[PDB]
Design a protein around this nucleic acid. Structure first.
Lengths: 117, 154, 66
RNA sequence: UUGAGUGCAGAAGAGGAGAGUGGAAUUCCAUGUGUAGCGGUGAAAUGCGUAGAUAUAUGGAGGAACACCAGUGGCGAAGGCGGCUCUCUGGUCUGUAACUGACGCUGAGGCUCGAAAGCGUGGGGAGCAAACAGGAUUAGAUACCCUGGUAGUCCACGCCGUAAACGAUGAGUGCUAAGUGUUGGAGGGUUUCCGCCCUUCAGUGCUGCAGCAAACGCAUUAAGCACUCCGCCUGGGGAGUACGACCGCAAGGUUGAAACUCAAAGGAAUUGACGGGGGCCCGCACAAGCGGUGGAGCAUGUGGUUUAAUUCGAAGCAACGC
């Protein structure tokens, strides 16, 4: 609805799950697809194969509301962050800006411990 | 294997059709070297093509080489143990291997109640865009660039 | 093997030279190491104190992603 | 007047105390958008979400640490010290050498400083996290894995006086081949040297002669050649324990035995040996393939039961049509 067609996508991908969400210019949220939401569970959500079809099921419900141009907000250092963008162009959008905004601190707090395994 | 490469033993053509790859299609259904049943009913099935929607068996064999042709192939080459592969460029050796294995092991999957009408409809399918072996070429086109999510760090 | 920065015999970093500011920082917003330019050791410290005063008034940004 | 100190001219330094201040990140709150998941593992579970999160955008609150430069780099007597600005302030090194004229070195007692953890009193609390709670693995797991979470970590004032406070090398001073970088000076030359060479004072690394060493190694930053002053040791346990004394609120610290055992304990190196290391090198060991087992029934061998006995042995690879 209202056919803005100038959206902002969002990319977040840990070592164990990924979420893509496509919003407005600012953006207020429109449609989002998660690797857990597409039937996958547990540990297999880490793989880059989910990042294709999560992006596809995001873009379908996205451009039902009418969507041509897009911004690419990249958080979440994981695995399929590049596959999500490459399948994002494969369903016909206007990726032209790559910002891998990874929030790094300046030694504020302390990390958790090692994993004595 | 481990030491180095090895030969491939290319097949001789037929003294009847005069075509090499027809012999490659012969030598995948034939069990225990029984050329008498299996190869002759393959002759009968291509003559069924010649009698219904066909003129010469060599040209329609080339038409089957069209519509079954494996254009790509993957091979599971792990590094750290995980599911790692890439759509590799297929050798025309291994192209013929994959395509004729699709045709023969779908003639296994077909299983029609006449021992050569399964072969007749099998090659009417593999020569004329139909049957699930041509749809196996479709599904081979499918996973080509669909396991590419983990095949671009190469 | 690498040249220095005081060919013009610069004496005092003077807290305000925004044009001499740009020779050393990264375009993203960091500081290049002294292995890169081969500059002087005490002059490295002068540059560091200079641009750390520069980031506080706002004659250079802290983080420049855009 | 050479040792030592005071001139005068200079140079570097995350040396210390006090007072203010800067941005990013994590968390909490306020609000807009959005629906059905978020999160973790080897795998799963507990937990959180339909009283609308996880996600995104804007703004506020708050405490701690200071991203890159950062380097066998710097400073301090040792512990140690890294965002920026101001005030107070201690030491080091170089040049000069008018001045004082041996004023030095070491230090049993004594006094001061003294990581982390801890105690008392009063503030503060974002993370992280002993104890404690739950979930799972385990034959068992009051452990390692995951989700929570207090005292603590911080600040102000006292207390304690410990470490692998290790370079396991006390300090002052003089002598003995070389090569090699680097931090800070000063001086001479070509040269606008700040783009080179040459020499010298002070630290800091690396390789290497004589020599020392049981070996390992060390080697102008001695574990060589020597003098001065201090400290400590004399087989292994019992044991830094017992008793006494001193200090501490307390935990504790300092000092410090013997009875009674044993013929060993210990350092270094040599031959088979591990690396969760690869250079290999192979091999139906894999990847690629076909066919077979495990289905139904029949026959056999073994384990089992039954037996008047179901007559010996065989027992993963390397026993069961033996």
């Amino acid at each position: 609805k209202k056919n803005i067609e100038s959206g902002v996508a969002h990319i977040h991908s840990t070592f164990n799950n990924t979420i893509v969400m496509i919003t407005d210019t600012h953006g207020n949220a429109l449609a989002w697809s998660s690797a857990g939401s597409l039937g996958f569970k547990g540990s297999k959500k880490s793989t880059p194969f989910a990042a294709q079809m999560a992006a596809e099921a995001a873009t379908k419900v996205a451009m039902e509301h009418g969507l041509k141009t897009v911004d690419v907000t990249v958080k979440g250092p994981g695995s399929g962050r590049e596959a999500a963008i490459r399948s994002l162009q494969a369903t016909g959008l206007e990726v032209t800006a790559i910002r891998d905004v990874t929030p790094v601190p300046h030694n504020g707090c302390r990390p958790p411990k090692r994993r004595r395994v | 294997p481990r030491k180095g490469p090895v030969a491939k033993r290319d097949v001789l053509p037929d003294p009847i059709y005069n075509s090499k790859l027809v012999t490659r299609l012969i030598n995948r259904v034939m069990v225990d070297g029984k050329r008498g049943i299996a190869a002759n009913i393959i002759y009968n099935s291509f003559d069924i093509i010649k009698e219904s929607t066909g003129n010469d068996p060599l040209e329609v064999f080339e038409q089957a080489m069209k519509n079954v042709m494996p254009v790509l192939e993957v091979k599971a080459r792990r590094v750290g143990g995980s599911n790692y592969q890439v759509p590799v460029e297929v050798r025309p050796e291994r192209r013929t291997t994959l395509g004729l294995r699709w045709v023969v092991n779908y003639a296994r999957l077909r299983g029609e109640h006449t021992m050569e009408e399964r072969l007749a409809k099998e090659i009417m399918d593999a020569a004329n865009n139909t049957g699930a072996s041509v749809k196996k070429r479709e599904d081979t086109h499918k996973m080509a660039d669909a396991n590419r999510a983990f095949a671009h760090y190469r | 093997k690498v040249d220095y920065i005081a060919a013009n015999h610069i004496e005092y970093i003077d807290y305000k030279d925004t044009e001499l500011l740009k020779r050393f920082i990264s375009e993203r917003g960091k500081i290049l190491p002294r292995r890169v330019t081969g500059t002087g050791a005490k002059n490295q410290r002068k540059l560091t104190i200079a641009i750390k005063r520069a980031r506080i008034m706002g004659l250079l940004p802290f983080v420049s992603d855009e």
